[PDB]
Amino acid sequence: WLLIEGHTIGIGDSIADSKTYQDIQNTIKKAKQDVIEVIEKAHNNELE
């Protein structure tokens, strides 16, 4: 049956939406800002 219907994989199975890419970049930027914030707290010796 797979001989008829066929299975594959390609580039189109990896591309996400532009809104998705914007959301992922926003999440990465927020994570980087948060780790910058916590390392700044660790720099000035307030991290208990």
Added chain:
Amino acid sequence: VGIRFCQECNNMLYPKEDKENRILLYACRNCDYQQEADNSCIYVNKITHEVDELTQIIADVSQDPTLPRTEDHPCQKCGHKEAVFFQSHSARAEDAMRLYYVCTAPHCGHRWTE
């Protein structure tokens, strides 16, 4: 807190108590050279090891290329709104992530830690 050496044979000095006058008497037992010590301290050991690292840092570390370079937090003796920040990174001497600021002026070198 501090040690010194013998005079006429130039050897290392060992302690001795005095039987008569009850004063500590540093002396070289390769000699008969006896003298008193004004410090009145023989042995100190900071086991928790809170030494002052401000004398540990070389005043010339600021002119390193690959160290960071901040723009805020100016120096004290001179204004010079440019400084270098780093950590001690000394093993077994505490675990603090607190920063060691050095002024980067060529003739300055007043270092502070906030």
